[PDB]
């Protein structure tokens, strides 16, 4: 089970170097023997990952063929052949109906298979992306000699060496290292380099310095280590298996589809058999009994419906594509519109993932800078002379420079060569001050002391730009405390003054507050060296303190920061209005995580955590009742201790939750916990650390620009633009699709009744068959298709975003209210309209309705050329048939005519056509025109009477169903009027789809 993989790992970092060797049977200096390494290779197996097994496409296609409807269609197709077979043997029947109808039905199943197959798509190449990471080989020390070997050859126990630029070949216990830094973004999602040393820093192995992990790479320095784990055994290797291990799952939309299929299938079987027996009692021969059955199957199954759904989904997907939202899986189009909880990564998802300056402390005041990329904020302070002094140090005391050719791009966007801190400062001055280079030009730097590990400060001496006294100015920056020890005076406003305790205290307060913000704080100070003491020639010695470091003047403090994407706060609120719970799950530190949570709106104003209550009350945390706190921030270290039941409690107990410093597996655990509740969950993320969570999520959405390749492979949907707003659109789109799908389904189903009823009457009444099997296919396959699809275009009747997410258990795509309206009410009206035209055609021809009962035996008899009508005229076999076929054609047209009203009514569930406007939908109107055009073409075009048995209809014939079509429009309009008038229940509960 994957369950093992869900848990946190255990390691050997605690052991001493020597002890580690004992377990491994290895040598710290010499390394393993060639023989020993080989022996372990056979024992343990290769240092490689082995992907799981998959399925073929052929099987995938065939599986669809067994989609209920397909099953019924199959029985019909075979039953056609069966009747044909009986026929061929017994009496030579020249006809080819059955045989042909059998052919047609089989084709319908196959084509339908393609549609479902298309919908069912799963494009997944997760393992492939991981394979892309793999390097080649690794250097090991064996027999006291270092040599490069195939990485797979690596085994636990050997001595491995890595240097900057190499990927860690396997999990390693660091024995020795020199200036080694590593990028553990694979585990954390954070790219900042982490030092690696032999010393054991922390109890958690994920945190400790002495371990280096596979799937990460060495940024700089060199290190040697002993391999603890290989292949699948590695920490990431397990994550790989887990990601591979987790099932794709089934989309909710898919579940809904199967649900109605069972309903429709059930009714189909019931009526099918129910009438089969009823016929036998009647004395119908098996030869006939089967033919009726085939008709029943065709009438009951909506042949066109599954395809319509696929088309509607595809159309919705196309609109989203225009949005820069690409949908890999057609079903995913809905999912979103069914999400109840969103688990979101912070960095690169919610946030821009771009560092930047925060605020500054000068003139005994805290000022806040504009963090936003577009710089949507306001200015903190231009005027104070103190600012200029601070600005100069930030510019001068800085090594960083912009890459050339950047001029086109905005200042915060451009790439800079230097550390993050210096780049932030550079960008800060360049923005407010103008070109930094100019400042560096005006004040030439004669001498400088670069930031030292020991010194903890950086110092520079420049020639004052002022022509009056182009003398030497000294500037330095470093740890705030250290700079403070160095200063005698403070530049308050323009003038300096002695550093009294009061100002010093203010410094501490400012320093503590900024730090509380989770911001990195730096101190800045300068000193105007005395001119007499330093001549213009005066040489300065960098190595030896040639000039005074103390009694300097403290200018001010500067702190740093990052930010949410512009759309994010709004999007979060919209999700919340929708009733979706938003949870933050991030690798990042808690102070930062909580701050952003407030910024984005994950934590609403006034909501408190247990810790914040304790602070405000100034009472112990133990004393606070946890129930009192709606909001919670949980650190990963704590999470590790907790059982899932405990996790469940946290989820139930808090509305606003932040999971910080989580590992990738813990993200998965959080997702599973939410799902355990029975909630549909969406995950949003950009990093590799998101991969397991993304896979597990009912729907995973990855950021396109920012996103790593792995995250994108893990996800169901990609936001190409990184537009978070798209999530809100996505949720609305799924809901709209469900709402529109219901309309389209009801529309399609309603026509089933007029198809069913003629067959029933045929048996009970013994009248000539009102409508044929072929004719049914003309409706479901031909006429109804465009109109049914057009419903996908419908706009929302109400504020969809306002409502809560659908209860997948309770609210279904097809429910009893839909059947009652489609089958019971409207379809019934359509059936009569069909019959009426049937009676009119026959009566006009000479067969009055009275005469028709019990006529079919004579009517069908091929032998009887002389059937007598009401008039007393005699008709041949073929002649009467023409009339009969004409009846089929008019009945067919009557369905089309009745469908016109149905299309209009299906347009809105609640609202009136007047309100919605039965009009804005261009596609819908096109559907009406094309459907009529097709029907006319089918009746009028020459040759169609041969193949389809459609006959030309008189102008008057078109009119027959008109009164029925109108009644439907009025009836539905009155019904809906009632629903809106009284939200109470009766009409609503029963009929409201």
């Amino acid at each position: 089970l994957e369950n093992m993989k869900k848990e946190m790992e255990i390691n050997d970092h605690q052991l001493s170097v020597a002890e580690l060797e004992q377990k491994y049977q290895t040598s710290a200096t010499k390394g393993l023997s060639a023989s020993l390494a080989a022996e372990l290779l056979l024992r343990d197996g290769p240092n490689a990952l082995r992907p799981p097994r998959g399925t073929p496409e052929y099987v995938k296609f065939a599986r669809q063929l067994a989609g209920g409807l397909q099953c019924l269609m199959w029985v019909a197709a075979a039953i056609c052949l069966i009747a044909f077979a009986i026929q061929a043997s017994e009496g030579d029947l020249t006809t080819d109906d059955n045989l042909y109808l059998a052919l047609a039905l089989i084709a319908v199943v196959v084509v339908t298979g393609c549609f479902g197959y298309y919908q069912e798509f799963k494009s997944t190449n997760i393992i492939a992306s991981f394979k892309n990471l793999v390097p080649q080989q690794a250097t090991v020390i064996r027999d006291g000699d270092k040599f490069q070997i195939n990485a797979d050859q690596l085994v636990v126990g050997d001595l491995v060496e890595m240097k900057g630029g190499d990927r860690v070949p396997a999990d390693i216990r660091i024995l020795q290292a020199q200036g080694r830094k590593v990028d553990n973004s694979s585990l954390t999602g954070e790219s900042e380099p982490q030092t690696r040393s032999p010393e054991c820093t922390h109890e958690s192995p994920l945190e400790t310095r002495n371990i280096a992990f596979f799937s990460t790479m060495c940024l700089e320095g060199t290190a040697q280590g002993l391999v603890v784990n290989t292949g699948d055994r590695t920490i990431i290797g397990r994550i790989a298996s887990l990601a591979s291990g987790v099932e794709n799952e089934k989309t909710p939309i898919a579940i809904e589809i199967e649900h109605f299929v069972d309903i429709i299938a059930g009714l189909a079987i019931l009526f099918g058999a129910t009438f089969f027996i009823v016929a036998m009692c009647i004395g119908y021969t098996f030869l006939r009994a089967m033919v009726f059955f085939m008709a029943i199957v065709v009438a009951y199954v909506p042949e066109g419906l599954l395809a319509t759904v696929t088309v509607c989904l595809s159309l919705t997907a196309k609109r989203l594509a225009s949005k820069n939202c690409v949908v890999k899986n057609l079903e995913a189009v809905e999912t979103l519109g069914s999400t109840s909880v969103i688990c979101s990564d912070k960095t690169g998802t919610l946030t821009q993932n771009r560092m930047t300056v925060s605020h500054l402390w000068f003139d005994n005041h805290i000022h806040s800078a504009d963090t936003t990329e577009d710089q949507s904020g306001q200015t903190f302070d231009q005027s104070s002379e103190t600012w200029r002094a601070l600005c100069r140090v930030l510019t001068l005391c800085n090594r960083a420079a912009f890459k050339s050719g950047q001029d086109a791009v905005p200042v915060p966007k451009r790439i800079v060569i230097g550390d993050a801190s210096e780049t932030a400062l550079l960008k800060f001055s360049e923005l407010t001050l103008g070109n930094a280079m100019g400042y560096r030009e005006r004040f030439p730097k004669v001498c400088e002391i670069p930031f030292n590990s020991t010194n903890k400060f950086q110092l520079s001496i420049h020639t004052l730009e002022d022509p009056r006294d182009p003398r030497h100015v000294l500037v330095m920056k470093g740890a705030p405390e250290r700079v403070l020890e160095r200063c005698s005076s403070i530049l308050i406003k323009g003038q300096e003054l002695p550093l009294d305790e009061q100002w010093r205290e203010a410094f501490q307060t400012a320093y503590l507050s900024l730090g509380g913000l989770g911001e990195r704080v730096l101190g800045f100070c300068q000193l105007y060296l005395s001119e007499k003491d330093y001549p213009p020639g005066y040489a300065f010695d960098v190595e030896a303190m040639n000039f005074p470091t103390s009694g300097l003047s403290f200018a001010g403090l500067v702190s740093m920061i990052d930010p949410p994407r512009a759309t994010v706060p709004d999007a979060v609120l919209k999700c919340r209005t929708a009733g979706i719970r938003v949870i933050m799950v991030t690798g990042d530190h808690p102070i930062t995580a909580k701050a952003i949570a407030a910024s984005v709106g994950i934590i609403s104003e006034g909501s408190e955590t247990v810790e914040d209550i304790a602070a405000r009350l100034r009472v112990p945390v133990d004393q606070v009742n946890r129930k009192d706190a709606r909001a919670c921030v949980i650190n990963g270290m704590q999470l590790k201790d907790m059982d899932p039941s405990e996790l469940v409690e946290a989820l139930r107990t808090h509305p606003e939750m932040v999971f910080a410093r989580t590992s990738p597996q813990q993200k998965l655990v959080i997702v599973e916990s939410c799902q355990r509740l029975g909630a549909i969950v969406a995950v949003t993320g950009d990093g590799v650390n998101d991969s397991p969570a993304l896979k597990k999520a009912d729907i995973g959405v990855a950021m396109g620009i920012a996103g790593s390749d792995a995250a994108k492979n893990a996800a169901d949907m990609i936001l190409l633009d990184d537009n978070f707003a798209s999530i809100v659109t996505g949720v609305e789109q799924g809901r709209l699709i469900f709402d529109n799908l219901k309309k389209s389904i009801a529309y399609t189903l309603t026509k089933n009744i007029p198809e069913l009823t003629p067959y029933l009457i045929y048996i009970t009444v013994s009248v000539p068959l009102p409508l044929g099997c072929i004719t049914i296919l003309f409706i479901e396959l031909c006429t109804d298709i465009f109109p049914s699809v057009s419903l996908a275009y419908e706009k929302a009747e109400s504020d969809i975003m306002h409502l809560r997410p659908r209860n997948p258990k309770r609210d279904r795509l097809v429910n009893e209210p839909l059947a009652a309206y489609s089958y019971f009410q409207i379809g019934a009206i359509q059936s009569f309209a069909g019959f009426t035209d049937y009676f009119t055609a026959m009566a006009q021809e000479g067969w009055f309705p009275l005469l028709c009962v019990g006529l079919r035996p004579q009517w069908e008899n091929h032998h009887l050329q002389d059937l007598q009508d009401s008039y007393g005229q005699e008709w041949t076999f073929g002649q009467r048939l023409y009339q009969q076929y004409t009846c089929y054609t008019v009945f067919f047209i009557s369905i089309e005519m009745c469908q016109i009203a149905d299309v209009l009514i299906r347009k809105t569930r609640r609202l009136s056509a007047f309100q919605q406007g039965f009009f804005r939908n261009r596609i819908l109107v096109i559907a009406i025109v094309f459907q009529v055009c097709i029907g006319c073409f089918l009746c009028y075009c020459p040759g169609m009477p041969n193949i389809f048995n459609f006959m030309p209809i008189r102008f008057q014939w078109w009119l027959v169903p008109m009164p029925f079509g109108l009644l439907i429009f009025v009836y539905d309009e009155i019904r809906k009027l009632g629903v809106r008038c009284c939200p109470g229940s009766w009409w609503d509960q029963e009929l409201y789809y």
Partner: protein, 246 residues
């Protein structure tokens, strides 16, 4: 599936399907009003008259009557239908109609109720000479489909010639001074003329041959008559395959 609410369902449909049968019937009964109780609104379809025969067709009969002269039981099926039709033209049945001769069309007036039952021409089975019935070499009877206010013909009578070229057979016709006599038309319709009798034309195939299927088609000619057979083989003609397999 509800409870103590089903009464809200049953009662619903009771007077909704009620309302709908009520409307459906509502529209049949209006339609029915606008038709003449003596003549259909459209005659086209029927327009070319069909020709039908007495012998129940096994398949393409009228004489697709394969039987054995040597066997009594073999013919009996065809005889039943034969007797059934002829029984109708009994003299007992005709008392009150009028006697005619072979001649022109007779016009009873318009297709109106103001006159009583339009008097039809009498037809004696006796006119069909020599025709249980033919045990060997059957004597099939032909008939022209009735069509109101239709006058087929020109000259005295509409001919019927049956033909196979085509192996030997001997055609003999028995038709009341002629073929189809014109005095029988036009047909007023069942409402206007109840026990109306249409002219019959007996045909006898004395053919010398035996033991082979002979495709014999009997055709009627007229300006009014047209034929298909690319569809209704009945349209103004017969398709009978006689086989006296003995």
């Amino acid at each position: 599936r509800t409870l103590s609410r089903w009464v809200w369902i049953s009662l619903y449909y009771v007077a909704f399907y009620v309302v709908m049968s009520g409307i459906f019937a509502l529209c049949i009964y209006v339609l029915m009003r606008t038709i003449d109780p003596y003549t259909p609104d459209y005659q086209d379809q029927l327009k070319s008259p069909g020709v039908t025969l007495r012998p129940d067709v096994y398949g393409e009969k009228g004489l697709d009557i394969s039987y054995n002269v040597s066997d009594s039981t073999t013919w009996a099926g065809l005889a039943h239908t034969l007797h059934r039709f002829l029984a109708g033209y009994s003299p007992a049945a005709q008392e009150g109609s009028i006697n005619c001769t072979s001649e022109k069309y007779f016009f009873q007036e318009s297709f109106l109720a103001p006159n009583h039952t339009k008097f039809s021409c009498k037809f004696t089975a006796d006119m069909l000479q020599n025709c249980g019935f033919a045990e060997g070499k059957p004597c099939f009877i032909i008939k022209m489909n009735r069509i109101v206010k239709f006058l087929p013909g020109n000259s005295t009578a509409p001919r019927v010639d049956c033909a196979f070229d085509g192996p030997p057979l001997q055609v003999e016709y028995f038709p009341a001074n002629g073929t189809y006599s014109l005095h029988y038309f036009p047909y007023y319709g069942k409402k206007a003329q109840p026990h109306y009798s249409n002219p019959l034309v007996a045909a006898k195939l004395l053919n010398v041959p035996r033991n082979r299927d002979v495709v014999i088609v009997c055709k009627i000619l007229a300006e009014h008559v047209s034929f298909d057979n690319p569809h209704d083989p009945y349209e103004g003609k017969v398709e009978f395959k006689l086989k006296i397999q003995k």
